[PDB]
Design a protein around this ligand. Structure first.
Ligand SMILES: C[C@@H](F)C(=O)N1CCc2ccc(-c3ccc(C(F)(F)F)cc3)cc2C1
Length: 219
C-alpha cells in the first residue's frame, strides 16, 4: 500500500551514512541514501510494477538468486527501491569517520529475523553481510532496530572512490552495474519475509537524497 511491506514485515526506515566528530560535544552526519518512515495515505497511488525478469541479470542468478527466491515466494514480499544518493558530503571526511547503516522494521508477530545484504557488481556477489535482529514491543506492533551497523570495507572504498570521480555522469555509469539485494528471513524457519532490490543513481542536480519504490511482479 505504498509500503515496502510483506504481509509479515514492513521496512520502516533505511539509512546509510557517514558520521564525523567535529569536537567533543559535536557530531556531523551525512546520509548517502535514505528511506524515512511515512504513514500510508488513502489518497496515495499504488506502487508501479517492475517485472522481476527484467532485473534478474543485475543480481546473482543461482541458488540464492532472485529467481529462485521469487519462485519460493511470497511474491507480495518482493520490492524494488531506486536510490538517488547524496554524494555531496560537504563535510571533511577524515581518518576516523564512522560508516554505517541504520534501519527499522516492524511486524505484527514477534520473530527472530535474519538480514542478508548482498553487495553486487555486474550481477556478481562481491560481499554478503548477515545480521540477526530481535523483536521489541512498541505501540501495537513489534519493531526491529538495527543501530549503526558498521559498513564493510568494500563499500567504504567504493563510496570514496566513487566520490573521487570528476563528474556525476561518470558516477551514474558506474552505479548502473552496482546493486544491493536485501533478503530478510525468519531465522529458524528461513521463510522469506521481505526482499528488496536496491538500484542506485547519483543525484545530478542535488536536492539531497531521493528514492522511489516499485513492486516486483512476475505476470
Ligand atoms: C556490510 C554491507 F552491507 C555494507 O557495507 N552496506 C550495505 C547497505 C548499504 C546500502 C547502500 C549503500 C550506499 C550506496 C550508495 C552510496 C553512494 F551514494 F555513495 F553512491 C553510498 C552508500 C551502502 C551500504 C553499506
Amino acid at each position: 500500500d505504498r509500503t515496502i511491506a510483506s504481509s509479515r514485515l514492513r521496512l520502516l526506515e533505511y539509512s546509510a551514512f557517514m558520521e564525523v566528530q567535529r569536537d567533543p560535544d559535536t557530531y556531523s552526519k551525512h546520509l548517502f541514501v535514505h528511506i524515512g518512515q511515512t504513514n500510508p495515505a488513502f489518497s496515495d497511488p499504488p506502487l508501479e510494477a517492475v517485472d522481476v525478469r527484467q532485473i534478474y541479470d543485475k543480481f546473482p542468478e543461482k541458488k540464492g538468486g532472485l529467481k529462485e527466491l521469487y519462485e519460493k515466494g511470497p511474491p507480495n514480499a518482493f520490492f524494488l527501491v531506486k536510490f538517488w544518493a547524496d554524494l555531496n558530503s560537504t563535510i571533511q571526511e577524515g581518518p576516523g569517520a564512522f560508516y554505517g547503516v541504520s534501519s527499522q522494521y516492524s511486524s505484527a508477530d514477534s520473530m527472530t529475523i535474519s538480514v542478508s545484504t548482498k553487495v553486487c557488481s555486474f550481477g556478481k556477489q562481491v560481499v554478503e553481510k548477515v545480521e540477526t535482529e530481535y523483536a521489541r514491543l512498541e505501540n501495537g506492533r513489534f519493531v526491529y532496530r538495527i543501530h549503526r551497523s558498521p559498513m564493510c570495507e568494500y563499500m567504504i572504498n567504493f563510496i570514496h572512490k566513487l566520490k573521487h570521480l570528476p563528474e556525476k555522469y561518470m558516477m551514474n555509469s558506474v552505479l548502473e552495474n552496482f546493486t544491493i539485494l536485501q533478503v530478510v528471513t525468519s531465522r529458524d524457519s528461513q521463510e522469506t519475509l521481505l526482499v528488496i532490490a536496491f538500484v542506485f543513481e547519483v543525484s545530478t542536480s542535488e536536492h539531497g537524497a531521493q528514492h522511489h519504490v516499485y513492486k516486483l511482479v512476475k505476470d
